[PDB]
Amino acid sequence: VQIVYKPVDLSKVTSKCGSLGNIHHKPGGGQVEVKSEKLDFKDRVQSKIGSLDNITHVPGGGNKKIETHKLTF
Amino acid sequence: VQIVYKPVDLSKVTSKCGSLGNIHHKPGGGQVEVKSEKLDFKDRVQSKIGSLDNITHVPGGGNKKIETHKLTF
Amino acid sequence: VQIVYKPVDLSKVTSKCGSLGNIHHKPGGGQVEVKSEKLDFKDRVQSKIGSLDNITHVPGGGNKKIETHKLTF
Amino acid sequence: VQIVYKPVDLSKVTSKCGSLGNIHHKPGGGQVEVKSEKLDFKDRVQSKIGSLDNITHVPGGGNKKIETHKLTF
Amino acid sequence: VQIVYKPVDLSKVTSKCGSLGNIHHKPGGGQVEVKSEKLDFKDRVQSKIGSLDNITHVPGGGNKKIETHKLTF
Amino acid sequence: VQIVYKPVDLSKVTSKCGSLGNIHHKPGGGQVEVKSEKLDFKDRVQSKIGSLDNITHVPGGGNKKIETHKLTF
């Protein structure tokens, strides 16, 4: 048995941007009011209140090559 | 048996943008009011209140190449 | 048995951005008011209140190559 | 009279367990509210209220051999 | 008369357990409220209120041999 | 008369546990409120209130051999 596994790649993944900017992200500008009375928790509680986990992501290029080569005999 | 596995790939994935910008994202500009009375929880609670997990994502190029090569004998 | 595993890569993953900036991220500009009376917790509590885990991420290039080679006999 | 009582016993009672666990028992997570007004007992009273006599029993092996030998002459 | 009582035993009662754990027992997580007004008792009262007599029993082996030999003459 | 009473035992009652642990027992996590007004008892009263007589029992091996021999002549 001969197996020859010779995949060849000359690919390009490219971008050109003349400028990138003037980007505004303002989560949670409105007031948040939470009022709790006489509550009863008999098991686990997770509480998030306000402005959490918000992302601004502005990469000058966010290009991806994802590449898997697999041989199973 | 001979198996010759010789795929060749000269592809290009490309973008050009003259400029990118003036982008405005404003989640949760409105007020949030939560009033809770006499509630009773016999099991687990997850609570999110306000402005959470909002994404602004402005890649100057967001190009993707996804590529899988598989041989099973 | 011969297995010859000779994958060849000449790839490029690239970006050019002429300028990158004027990026604004303002989570939680609104007031957060949390008022609790007579609450009763009989198991674990996690509480986050205010402005937490917000990300600004502005890489001059955030390009990725991900490349996996596997041979199983 | 000759009586020979010679039962012979090479038996095995056996278990193998790869792992045992992740067992949750939560009796009485609901509230109990008892309101008694103007009751009249002319004899003995036994009252159990709440969470009583609850068993969790998790033996790593819970085998029984029960063996009775009786001779009546 | 000859009576020869000679039961011969080579029994085994056995377990092998790879691990035993992650056992949770939470009786009476709910509240108990007992309100008694104007009650009359002519005879004996036993009252149990709350979380009583609850058992967690986790033996790494719980094997029993129970073995009774009786001769009546 | 001859009575020979020669029961013979080579038995074993056995366990092997690779690890034992991570056992949690929390009786009476809920509050107990008892309010008694204008009650009248003409005989003995036993009252248990709160968290009483609760057992945790975790023996590394909790095997039993019970072996009873009786000859009645």
From Swiss-Prot, chains A, B, C, D, E, F:
Looking at the UniProt record, the site noted as Not glycated sits at K6, K12, K16, K26, K35, K38, K65, K70
The residues bearing each Tau/MAP repeat, given as ranges, are 1-31, 32-63
Tissue specificity field: Expressed in neurons. Isoform PNS-tau is expressed in the peripheral nervous system while the others are expressed in the central nervous system.
Q: What is the effect of changing S47L?
A: In fatal respiratory hypoventilation; unusual apparent autosomal recessive inheritance; reduced binding to microtubules as well as increased fibrillization and aggregation
**Where can this protein be found?**
Cytoplasm, Cytosol; Cell membrane; Cytoplasm, Cytoskeleton; Cell projection, Axon
User: N6,N6-dimethyllysine is carried by which residues?
Assistant: K6
For the modification Phosphoserine, which residues carry it? S19, S47, S51
Top-level taxon of the source organism: Eukaryota
Q: Which residues carry this modification: N6-acetyllysine?
A: K6, K12, K16, K26, K38, K42, K64
Domain comment quoted from the record: The tau/MAP repeat binds to tubulin. Type I isoforms contain 3 repeats while type II isoforms contain 4 repeats.
**How would you summarize the oligomeric state and partners of this protein?**
Interacts with MARK1, MARK2, MARK3 and MARK4. Interacts with PSMC2 through SQSTM1. Interacts with SQSTM1 when polyubiquitinated. Interacts with FKBP4. Binds to CSNK1D. Interacts with SGK1. Interacts with PIN1. Interacts with LRRK2. Interacts with LRP1, leading to endocytosis; this interaction is reduced in the presence of LRPAP1/RAP.
Q: What does this protein do?
A: Promotes microtubule assembly and stability, and might be involved in the establishment and maintenance of neuronal polarity. The C-terminus binds axonal microtubules while the N-terminus binds neural plasma membrane components, suggesting that tau functions as a linker protein between both. Axonal polarity is predetermined by TAU/MAPT localization (in the neuronal cell) in the domain of the cell body defined by the centrosome. The short isoforms allow plasticity of the cytoskeleton whereas the longer isoforms may preferentially play a role in its stabilization.
Q: What is this protein called?
A: Microtubule-associated protein tau
Supply the source organism for this entry: Homo sapiens
Q: What is the lineage of its organism?
A: Eukaryota, Metazoa, Chordata, Craniata, Vertebrata
List the gene name: MAPT
